[PDB]
Amino acid sequence: NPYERGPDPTEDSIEAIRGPFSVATERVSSFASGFGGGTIYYPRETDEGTFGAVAVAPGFTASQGSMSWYGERVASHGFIVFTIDTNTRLDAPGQRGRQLLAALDYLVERSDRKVRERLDPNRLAVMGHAMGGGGSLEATVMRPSLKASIPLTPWHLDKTWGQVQVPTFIIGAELDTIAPVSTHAKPFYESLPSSLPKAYMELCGATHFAPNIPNTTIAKYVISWLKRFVDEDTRYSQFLCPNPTDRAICEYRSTCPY
Ligand SMILES: COC(=O)c1ccc(P(=O)(O)OCCO)cc1
Ligand SMILES: [Ca+2]
Secondary structure, eight states, X not given: XXXXXXXXXXXXXXXOSSOSSOEEEEEEOTTSTTSOOEEEEEEOOOTTOOEEEEEEEOOTTOOGGXXXXXXXXXXXXXXXXXXXXXXXXXXXXXXHHHHHHHHHHHHHHTSOHHHHTTEEEEEEEEEEETHHHHHHHHHHHHOTTOSEEEEESOOOSOOOOTTOOSOEEEEEETTOSSSOTTTTHHHHHHHSOTTSOEEEEEETTOOTTGGGSOOHHHHHHHHHHHHHHHSXXXXXXXXXXXXXXXXXXXXXXXXXXX
16 A cells, blocks of 8 residues: 555554654635635655645634644644634535635645645545534535545534445534534434445543544544545554444444445
């Protein structure tokens, strides 16, 4: 696999706050086309090859600051991470989906040469919290060539997602009362195609805002999902299949094996 980066993983390595790569940043003006700008986190070391990229959207009435801890943590494992701001704080999930795509197109077409030279434009992914998680679902319908999708405590009014063909990892929060898992996260997961590589992880005692602070349970499996599907890195299947049994997880579902 020409896309494998970093040494062979252990459960300690995927739980490490800092991965094998050092990270630099690049700020993007809000006058970028089609989204509200943001911050690009990228691995500095270039001798292992180019990397895939993930655009990360915040929730309703939130900014990239609520998602900033994903920047260095995920990028240090070998990824370009773009925490974006939206055009307005009130943008809906469909709008956030379009803006995740515009952020990715920015990386491919308009980003700084330091980012462009490190990017593989064929291996892109989306992630989002709350309404941004609904935008992550929307973006996969809008661009089926995406490699992975991670809706974090997602909010969306539409409960059926049977046309998604992008591998999708939904994280729910047990005590979420803003986007309850019974009416958002779980219906979304169950409506994804039964043949799709997918998973649902519910966090014990977590609130709707659990994704907004550093969480090792979230981070270790976000890293494993992006490795498995953006990098085609089967070295990380061991952490995804069979279903994780971490104490912080109160329910896990998957279409393992993959
Ligand atoms: C029904 O009330 C609303 O307008 C509404 C407000 C927030 C969200 P959500 O994005 O999931 O949480 C915010 C995370 O920054 C969904 C709907
Ligand atoms: Ca703009």
